[PDB]
Amino acid sequence: EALLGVYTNVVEFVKFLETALAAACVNTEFKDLRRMIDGKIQFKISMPT
Amino acid sequence: AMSGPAAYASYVVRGANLVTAVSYGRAMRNFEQFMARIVDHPNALPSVE
Amino acid sequence: FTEYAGAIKTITSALQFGMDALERGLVDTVLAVKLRHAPPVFILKTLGD
Amino acid sequence: QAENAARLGRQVLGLLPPPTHRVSLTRGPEFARGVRDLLSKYAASTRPTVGSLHEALRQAPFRQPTYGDFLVYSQTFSPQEPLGTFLFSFKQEDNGSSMDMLLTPTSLFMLSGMEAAKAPQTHKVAGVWYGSGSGLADFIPNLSELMDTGEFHTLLTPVGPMVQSVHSTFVTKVTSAMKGVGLARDEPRAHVGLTLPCDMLVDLDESCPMREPAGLNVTIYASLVYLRVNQRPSMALTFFQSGKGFAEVVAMIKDHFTDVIRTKYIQLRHELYINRLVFGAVCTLGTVPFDSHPVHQSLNSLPVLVFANFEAACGPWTVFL
């Protein structure tokens, strides 16, 4: 009797940065995120009349 | 119109498979590729290309 | 040697498993943030005008 | 030939207890550099490799069992066992220098004399490893009288699973395992797990659910129940598996042996002997970690469970009723 083929899957990784999903986001590497408590972004909108 | 092969692929039990076919009663497709990965490059991870 | 070098192939492929299942965690949690901030068409269309 | 003795230079000096952490003060803060196994969070990279984490895999905790060396007659310990059975050491009197008596749970099934249908599977198997049951009872002539006053559970000290059995014609050498996971002899780098027959073991956590907490621990208990059958004294040994804590299981065991208690104490409305009042005892045979599946096996059939990662931690016998 014979072995005729010994086959196996290979899972190719798909990086987030090379998906087109990352077009809808802004990706910044941040070395020490465990140190941060809270982030904050402040807006100022003037409205003419 | 299409373009395919003209002959069958040939698998024959040659001198390295023929010893294990006679003596052990088990043979194998392409003994030389099994031998060139177990003993020649034992740490090579399976890649696609 | 072929027991050693076949055991280092297991422990890498168990640890390529770790990182390449954590790149899925980006793509899931980025998509999960978007679905929490995605109100449907019928609500948002008449607020758009 | 010194290449064969150079292998013992490697393997002995590489395999020693870790030394006491003693650094002279004149050297400086070098003692902080000698603390490696307390470090527990290793750095990961974008593509880590074994060459990056060979130092993380090098620190391992110091685990070692303590073996027990028993020299047994070859009539009691059957010459063929499944190499992971649980053991007991009966002890009555020091008669000779070193001849010891060991009891597998199928061997204590034959000294008991309990009926067939209450353990329907091992009665076939323990009837072929042994004779009618009087091949072992000639060692203990007091089995009619050890059951009356109830001194049999005080003469068993549970020992742990088998590791190796070197069998000769008249005498079998038996090496057990206490304190933890016994290292396997014939298969290298392996670990002997503890095997119980499916018949003796009575599982205790079972729900529809119709929610119980997960944990790290589940403890196998032994039980040994004094009763009477056919107006003759006989014992009954059952096992239990639950990580519920000792305050519940003593109430869980009494609901299992309800009918056994009811049939006995009908008899002592007429005669009350104070020796007869003692009923059972419970030992703690050591912990199993959580979510390990007991793997079913079959031997000749005899269905036999097996518990990987078993560690043995023996306790006393406490008399429940």
From TrEMBL, chain A:
<protein>
    <submittedName>
        <fullName>ORF25</fullName>
    </submittedName>
</protein>
UniProtKB/TrEMBL annotation, chain D:
<keyword id="KW-1048">Host nucleus</keyword>
<protein>
    <submittedName>
        <fullName>Core gene UL38 family protein</fullName>
    </submittedName>
</protein>
<dbReference type="GO" id="GO:0019028">
    <property type="term" value="C:viral capsid"/>
</dbReference>
<dbReference type="GO" id="GO:0019069">
    <property type="term" value="P:viral capsid assembly"/>
</dbReference>
<dbReference type="Pfam" id="PF03327">
    <property type="entry name" value="Herpes_VP19C"/>
</dbReference>
<keyword id="KW-0946">Virion</keyword>
<dbReference type="GO" id="GO:0003677">
    <property type="term" value="F:DNA binding"/>
</dbReference>
<dbReference type="InterPro" id="IPR004999">
    <property type="entry name" value="Herpes_1"/>
</dbReference>
<keyword id="KW-0167">Capsid protein</keyword>
